[PDB]
Design a protein around this ligand. Sequence first.
Ligand SMILES: [Ca+2]
Ligand SMILES: [Cl-]
Length: 258
Amino acid sequence: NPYERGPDPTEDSIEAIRGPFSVATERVSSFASGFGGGTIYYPRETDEGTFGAVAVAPGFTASQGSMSWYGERVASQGFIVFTIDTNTRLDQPGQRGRQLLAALDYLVERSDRKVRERLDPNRLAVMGHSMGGGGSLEATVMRPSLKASIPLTPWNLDKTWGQVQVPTFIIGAELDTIAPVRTHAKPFYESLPSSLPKAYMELDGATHFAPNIPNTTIAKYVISWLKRFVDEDTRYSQFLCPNPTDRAIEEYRSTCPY
Ligand SMILES: [Ca+2]
Ligand SMILES: [Cl-]
């Protein structure tokens, strides 16, 4: 596997705040076409080759700042990470899906050459919080060539996702009162085809804003999911299959093995 980056992982290394790669940023103006601009986090070291990318959307009335902590934490594991702003704070999940795709296309077609020359444009993913998590789902239906999708305490009025053909990792918050897991996250997960590589992780005692706060449980499995599906890196299969049983996890569902 030519997409492998970084030293062989361990239980500790996937929990590390700072991964093996150093991180730089490039700022993208709000005048970008199709989305609200944002921040690109990328690995500085190039000697191991080019990297896949993940676009990251915030939720209803939230801004890119609610998702900033994913930038360095994930990019330092060898990913290009684009935390975006949406056109307006009131945009719906379908719009956020389009804007995730516009952000990824910006990376491929228009971003600074320091980013573009580090990018593998065929290996792209989406992630998002709340309505942005609904947007993660929407994006995969709009573009099945995506490698991975991580809806974080997702919110969406459409409850059926049987058309999704992109490996999808849904994270739920047990006590989420804004996108209740019983009417959003779990219906979404169960609607995904049983043949799709997929997973559900519910955080014990967490509220809607757990993904907006540095969370080692979220980070270690976000990292593992992107490694396994953006890089096809089966060194990380060990952490996803069988179901993780971290004390922090209320419930976990999966279609392991992948
Ligand atoms: Ca714009
Ligand atoms: Cl809930």
